[PDB]
Design an enzyme around this catalytic site. Structure first.
Site, PDB file in Angstrom:
ATOM      1  N   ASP A 187       0.830  -1.198   0.000  1.00 46.25           N
ATOM      2  CA  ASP A 187       0.000   0.000   0.000  1.00 46.25           C
ATOM      3  C   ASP A 187       0.872   1.257   0.000  1.00 46.25           C
ATOM      4  O   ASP A 187       2.094   1.165  -0.073  1.00 46.25           O
ATOM      5  CB  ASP A 187      -1.012  -0.017   1.163  1.00 46.25           C
ATOM      6  CG  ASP A 187      -0.360  -0.234   2.528  1.00 46.25           C
ATOM      7  OD1 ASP A 187       0.502   0.579   2.925  1.00 46.25           O
ATOM      8  OD2 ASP A 187      -0.733  -1.208   3.222  1.00 46.25           O
TER       9      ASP A 187
HETATM   10  O1  LIG Z   1      -1.142   5.203  -0.497  1.00 45.07           O
HETATM   11  P1  LIG Z   1      -1.261   6.778  -0.802  1.00 45.07           P
HETATM   12  O2  LIG Z   1      -2.078   7.127  -2.024  1.00 45.07           O
HETATM   13  O3  LIG Z   1      -1.566   7.593   0.434  1.00 45.07           O
HETATM   14  O4  LIG Z   1       0.222   7.250  -1.213  1.00 45.07           O
HETATM   15  C1  LIG Z   1       0.847   6.805  -2.419  1.00 45.07           C
HETATM   16  C2  LIG Z   1       2.130   7.589  -2.677  1.00 45.07           C
HETATM   17  C3  LIG Z   1       2.631   7.263  -4.077  1.00 45.07           C
HETATM   18  C4  LIG Z   1       1.815   9.073  -2.556  1.00 45.07           C
HETATM   19  C5  LIG Z   1       3.194   7.203  -1.635  1.00 45.07           C
HETATM   20  O5  LIG Z   1       3.400   5.778  -1.634  1.00 45.07           O
HETATM   21  C6  LIG Z   1       4.506   7.913  -1.862  1.00 45.07           C
HETATM   22  O6  LIG Z   1       4.551   9.100  -2.163  1.00 45.07           O
HETATM   23  N1  LIG Z   1       5.604   7.177  -1.712  1.00 45.07           N
HETATM   24  C7  LIG Z   1       6.929   7.732  -1.913  1.00 45.07           C
HETATM   25  C8  LIG Z   1       7.243   7.793  -3.403  1.00 45.07           C
HETATM   26  C9  LIG Z   1       6.580   6.626  -4.103  1.00 45.07           C
HETATM   27  O7  LIG Z   1       6.460   5.550  -3.533  1.00 45.07           O
HETATM   28  N2  LIG Z   1       6.146   6.849  -5.342  1.00 45.07           N
HETATM   29  C10 LIG Z   1       5.503   5.807  -6.117  1.00 45.07           C
HETATM   30  C11 LIG Z   1       4.450   6.343  -7.075  1.00 45.07           C
HETATM   31  S1  LIG Z   1       3.514   4.929  -7.704  1.00 45.07           S
END
Ligand SMILES: *OP(=O)(O)OCC(C)(C)[C@@H](O)C(=O)NCCC(=O)NCCS
Ligand SMILES: *OP(=O)(O)OCC(C)(C)[C@@H](O)C(=O)NCCC(=O)NCCS
Lengths: 81, 81
Positions: free
Chosen positions: B38
């Site tokens: 997640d």
């Molecule tokens: O689960 P959520 O929508 O609250 O958050 C998802 C995101 C992508 C915002 C985080 O997991 C996040 O920002 N993580 C750090 C950078 C990433 O993992 N980016 C992946 C993009 S798919």
């Protein structure tokens, strides 16, 4: 809806929100890896799909939408409760 | 580093941060689709990789890390400026 009309419009949307050529879009095209969508392009795309098909793509479901096929598969599934 | 040691540790990390079986992790395993990570698991994973390999994965680069291979390919490339 039958997939053909659905795929026709998604293609038209993806090409509009990312400014790539319509014919360079294929079922297996990755949004971030093949089409070069950034953070803000993704937001704009997910919302464009949400308005055309009048669905709601929760942040949980958007994590699993990597390709155009994923977009189509989801739209077709989560439009009919 | 040679890939073998690198893949060994990433596997050990992914299995620790997502609590799936080590042997169910493969090069083509998708973090969100196959392994069920997640939003918060992803943050924790990206940071676990950042501390073990002492790299920095910008939010721009994290958009393109969908699979274990992507994780490895990136770590190997962006560790040597
Ligand atoms: O689960 P959520 O929508 O609250 O958050 C998802 C995101 C992508 C915002 C985080 O997991 C996040 O920002 N993580 C750090 C950078 C990433 O993992 N980016 C992946 C993009 S798919
Ligand atoms: O480009 P960025 O790191 O600032 O933001 C990336 C995220 C994933 C936070 C946004 O694109 C975002 O939250 N978009 C809405 C939901 C998604 O697109 N989720 C996809 C996760 S890969």
């Amino acid at each position: 809806s039958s997939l053909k009309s659905t795929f026709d419009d998604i293609k038209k949307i993806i090409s509009k929100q990312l400014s790539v050529e319509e014919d360079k879009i294929q079922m297996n095209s990755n949004f971030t890896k093949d089409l070069g969508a950034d953070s803000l392009d993704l937001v704009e795309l997910i919302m464009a799909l949400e308005e055309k098909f009048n669905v709601t793509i929760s942040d949980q479901d958007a994590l699993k939408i990597n390709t155009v096929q994923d977009a189509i598969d989801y739209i077709e599934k989560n439009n009919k409760q």
